[PDB]
Design a protein around this ligand. Sequence first.
Ligand SMILES: *Cc1c(COP(=O)(O)O)cnc(C)c1O
Ligand SMILES: *Cc1c(COP(=O)(O)O)cnc(C)c1O
Lengths: 387, 387
Amino acid sequence: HKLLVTPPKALLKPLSIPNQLLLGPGPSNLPPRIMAAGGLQMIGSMSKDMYQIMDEIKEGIQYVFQTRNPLTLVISGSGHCALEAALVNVLEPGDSFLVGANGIWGQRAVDIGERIGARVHPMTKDPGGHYTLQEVEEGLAQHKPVLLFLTHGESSTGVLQPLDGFGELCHRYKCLLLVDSVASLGGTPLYMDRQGIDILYSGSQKALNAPPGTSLISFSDKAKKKMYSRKTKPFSFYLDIKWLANFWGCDDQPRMYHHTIPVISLYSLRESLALIAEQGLENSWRQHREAAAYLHGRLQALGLQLFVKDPALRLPTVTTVAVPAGYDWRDIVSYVIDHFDIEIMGGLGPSTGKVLRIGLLGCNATRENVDRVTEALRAALQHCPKK
Amino acid sequence: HKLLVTPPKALLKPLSIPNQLLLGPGPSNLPPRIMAAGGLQMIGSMSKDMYQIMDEIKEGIQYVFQTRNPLTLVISGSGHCALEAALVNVLEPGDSFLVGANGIWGQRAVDIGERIGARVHPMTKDPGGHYTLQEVEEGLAQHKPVLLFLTHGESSTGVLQPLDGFGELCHRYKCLLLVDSVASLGGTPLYMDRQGIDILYSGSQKALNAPPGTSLISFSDKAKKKMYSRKTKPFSFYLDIKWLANFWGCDDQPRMYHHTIPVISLYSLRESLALIAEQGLENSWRQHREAAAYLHGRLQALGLQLFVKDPALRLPTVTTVAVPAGYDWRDIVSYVIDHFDIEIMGGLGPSTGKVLRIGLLGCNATRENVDRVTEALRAALQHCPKK
Ligand SMILES: *Cc1c(COP(=O)(O)O)cnc(C)c1O
Ligand SMILES: *Cc1c(COP(=O)(O)O)cnc(C)c1O
């Protein structure tokens, strides 16, 4: 007895949130349908009905990845968590692991790869750079790796990465391909099977406009063959693919309790996958391409220059803009949220302080929101200090 | 081009869920306020306003743990994820790790401990058993471990575990104490600092009645000293306490992007911590003790016998009931959900097939719901096959 801690006074106020228009690299704003799914009641986490939803979510990930892999499921964690789940289950220690260290996502693949004791060979490249099929055949040949990691949408630098044939290249060296489509999914063409991709993951909170906290993953039979014949148990129980696979109905064995899935986020995820199914993929890529074009046009009208020179290399979901001469970037960003209720972002990792990041994602990739962010940025340029 | 996968027809139907009354070991039903928090709009995952919520959540975990540890935060994952985060950050490989293998939660602590390459010494005990301060001083002495794991609320067997002095015992052998309060928090007395606990974690989805997918953790300065002087980097980047700690404002350094936290679940978690703050802890323990008493009474009226003989050892949030002679347990459980819209559960792991599990958690631990489950179970006993 004798209770030390008293009820925090801050908790006895009611919860209240500002209305913000989020137009950075993520998370993005939720449409009404995702919100309505968020406010539903709980069902049992192993109920027949829960399985039925999970199966729909599967079919959903199969559509947006354009894959038919049986080993396709949701990771109960953020984008980082899917990446880690991928790496920890594919890589035994000491294995050869090649990584396109293009921006932060490469760096994290490194960090994680290091952490789980693999021999990681970093093809590091300056921010704004991208990798040709040569640079990767070169790396493939001289390091002879079991797995390559590539960022599709590089949201720290705004670089779209070409993907055609790279999957074939990697098979040619008996290697596995791992693609990060967290920023790219729903916004720019992507076909898992036809591009021969072995591990694809994405996030809930970008173009799909679901709340952050889940992530999507799918494994080819090749990578699936490895995982089921690795001789050591992976370092995570939480992310263990065999346990995971069984629970999501990707096995021959009935579903056995592994962990409690985030039921409510799954309602929302389902709905987000439904919305893009109804619209259809090619229309979503079309929407994002036309919006990003519109935006690009407007920023250059303001005398800003787009960080990535080549337009065919610019990521449509996340645009990098160079920090104009004589401006503190923090001043501009502050001004935008302070005076317009709009969130945009600066750089991240190697792109830090050099760029501004403006995202168009899903239901937010509209000409209306491009207008709103452009005016905000006009105002800042004319009202922020200049040296 | 040439798109292989077509929009799943199942996704083009609208989402719909059955109303169920969940009265197993978790998840539990959400009150209206948690639901309303679920349906809110997104704010930026690194906004000043998001930090402010996270700080309230901190103060919230400090209250329900009754701790003042600065190293207190949320894990973006399920109950299992907190456990793993605890173990992966405390234990370097080869370390001596003692675990009360009382039910499944011990077994998982084993599995995980094994996975991260520690020398795990399992004090295995038959289901329904609990550990005295002797059995643990014995184990402490002969294995000399750096960390002990104990389940407080053992939801697979319904055993409440005594905790007073065990923290002192462990310090006496220079050891660290790890407690699982996932099932027990909010339902039965628990004081982190006064019981000298070094690592406490719980779940969102039990007595707190938030949606599943986040979990609560707190570290004493002792365990915190270890983690900051371990010589090897842990096997997970996702759960790395230094990265985590920094982002949740538990550092001297400004918050640096680690991963995107589940913003919406955090709204809900906050509200759940507010609701128990307003009610007050001791009233919640009182509610749960009086409900579990009521329930116990009613089941014995039906001629069922409570799995745990000693009442002072029965977990109030999760009651184990022996499977009556001549009944298929699956028949009963089915009958309950089929005819009453009520979920109860069977055993789990070592308790499988031997028991029925009935949970009372938070806003659901009411005399009203005890009535409803008792009648359901009357009906099943009189309407299910008997050998
Ligand atoms: C935002 C982002 C991530 C990280 O996802 P989290 O949900 O923060 O874990 C990973 N990859 C890319 C390309 C991203 O844009
Ligand atoms: C339900 C439960 C867990 C597991 O939590 P998840 O949220 O399924 O990861 C762990 N410990 C106890 C005591 C539980 O009751």
